[PDB]
Design a protein around this ligand. Structure first.
Ligand SMILES: COc1ccccc1NC(=O)C[C@@H](C)Cc1cc(C)cc(C)c1
Ligand SMILES: Cc1cnccc1CN1C[C@@H](c2cc(F)c(F)c(F)c2)CC1=O
Length: 479
């Protein structure tokens, strides 16, 4: 009872202080810094989705060792998302993001020098574990600096870096290793998979370097009884914004902010305390206040991720089938399709950013889910490569807005002390949905076109039906 009152006062005062600080240079600099980490995450997603499965053909492997790489790295990403999301509520957003990016970079670097398939599997699994935690931490970290007036608009532009990371991975795959033999022979002669792996690790290193310059989230400090650090961070934000805008004479007027109050044996007891706190935070999401919201968010996230990652493997096989049919009358195609998808998402991002705070998160999510279902059903009517590409671009452009709205809802539906835990759980569920979608839609290669399309459309329809029951968060202070 007392704690809820104190946290409500803290949220109100934090929104007032964010309004006093304003929006400007600091927020955009942090936006680029966190976009670097999102770009690294997109690079890893593309590498798991397209590079490794094609490389498995070159690396002669048994029938048992066909799906192995992608499956196990996605499982590592699923584990890491939950782990780092849980730890971010206890150690801090910046600290856990730095640790996860360091793990990802170190093991991506190590994977280049391996001389075995199993060692490469191990290194890439650990790299996936490191990279899994980026999205929840990045989104919560950036949201805790945005006022309620335009938080949704500024959060909607974060996925462009994920798209750019996918495009960068596709371009580097096409350039460094086009139709080459992935063997553990390459001799690191530039056109090598080792060189490709080394180049793919640059965004993570740059993200670490940039993130070392940014301050920890002051909301985390306030929620954990660190008044002075949060005050210093807020003063830094205010001074940066006012100096950038040409008003260095303005003085930060905030005085006091509401605050909430052998070696291996010690490490063990501290780690047990951390684990207990993380488990308690996870179990709190299924309490009487948040259980229904958690279940509905789980359903919507699972359906959207399942449909998207099913289509990501269904579409290239359909393109290959159409090309074969035309002929009977690789990497560059994937890169071109990724570039076109990144271009087509941009109008959807513009519309979502401009309408999120104007019409609300619920209407955006519902309309975009309905349009995504309609476009997924429309995908079945294409009968040529160009028509299929245009329909997929339309589907992506209409569907990205639902993802943006769901990110905003996930940020705003949970309290600050458990936001990253809930987001990490939902992102791990999304990774599981991606695994299931890829595995199931791979079995559909030999059957027909219509059935996978109908399956994905039904999943999107279920997600749209579930989206209607979520509560609206527009106009509220950040919990
Ligand atoms: C920007 O890409 C990516 C980003 C991150 C990871 C992978 C990719 N790339 C793909 O997954 C290939 C292709 C299916 C992307 C795509 C998606 C949509 C909805 C429409 C279009 C035209 C392309
Ligand atoms: C950035 C992000 C934020 N929150 C959760 C997950 C993510 C990462 N994404 C984006 C999603 C997506 C949706 C689309 F409709 C597209 F067209 C597209 F290309 C990609 C798929 C995914 O896993």
């Amino acid at each position: 009872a007392q704690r809820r009152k104190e946290r409500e006062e803290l949220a109100q005062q934090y929104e007032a202080i964010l309004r006093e600080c304003g929006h400007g240079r600091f927020q955009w600099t942090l936006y680029f810094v966190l976009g670097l980490a999102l770009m690294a995450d997109g690079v890893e997603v593309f590498v798991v989705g397209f590079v490794l499965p094609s490389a498995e053909k070159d690396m002669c492997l048994s029938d048992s060792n066909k799906g192995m790489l992608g499956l196990i790295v996605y499982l590592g990403m699923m584990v890491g998302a939950f782990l780092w999301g849980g730890l971010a509520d206890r150690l801090g957003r910046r600290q856990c993001l730095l640790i996860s990016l360091s793990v990802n970079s170190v093991f991506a670097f190590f994977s280049s020098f391996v001389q075995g398939y199993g060692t490469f599997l191990f290194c890439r699994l650990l790299s996936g574990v490191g990279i899994g935690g980026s999205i929840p931490i990045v989104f919560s970290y950036f949201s805790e600096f945005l006022a309620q007036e335009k938080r949704g608009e500024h959060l909607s532009w974060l996925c462009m870096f994920w798209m750019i990371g996918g495009v960068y991975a596709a371009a580097m795959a096409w350039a460094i290793i086009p139709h080459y033999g992935w063997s553990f022979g390459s001799a690191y002669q530039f056109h090598s998979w080792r060189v490709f792996v080394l180049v793919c690790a640059f965004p993570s290193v740059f993200a670490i370097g940039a993130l070392t310059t940014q301050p920890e989230s002051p909301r985390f400090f306030l929620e954990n009884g660190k008044h002075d650090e949060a005050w210093m961070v807020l003063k830094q934000v205010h001074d940066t914004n006012m100096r950038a805008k040409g008003h260095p004479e303005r003085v930060f007027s905030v005085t006091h902010i509401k605050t909430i109050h052998t070696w291996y044996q010690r490490w063990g007891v501290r780690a047990l305390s951390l684990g207990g706190q993380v488990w308690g935070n996870f179990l709190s999401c299924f309490g009487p206040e948040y259980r229904r919201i958690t279940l509905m968010m789980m359903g919507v996230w699972f359906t959207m991720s399942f449909s998207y990652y099913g289509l990501t493997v269904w579409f290239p096989d359909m393109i290959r089938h159409l090309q074969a049919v035309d002929y009977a009358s690789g990497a560059y195609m994937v890169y071109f399709v990724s570039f076109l998808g990144t271009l087509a998402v941009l109008p959807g991002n513009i519309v979502s950013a401009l309408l999120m705070d104007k019409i609300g998160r619920l209407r955006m999510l519902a309309g975009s889910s309905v349009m995504s279902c309609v476009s997924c059903f429309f995908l079945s009517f294409g009968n040529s490569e160009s028509a299929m590409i245009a329909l997929l671009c339309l589907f992506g452009g209409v569907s990205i807005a639902s993802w943006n709205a769901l990110d905003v809802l996930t940020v705003e539906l949970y309290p600050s002390d458990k936001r990253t835990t809930a987001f990490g759980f939902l992102n791990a569920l999304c990774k599981l949905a991606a695994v299931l979608g890829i595995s199931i839609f791979t079995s559909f290669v030999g059957i027909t076109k219509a059935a996978p399309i109908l399956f994905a459309s039904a999943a999107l329809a279920l997600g749209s039906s579930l989206a209607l029951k979520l509560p609206e968060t527009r106009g509220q202070v950040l919990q």
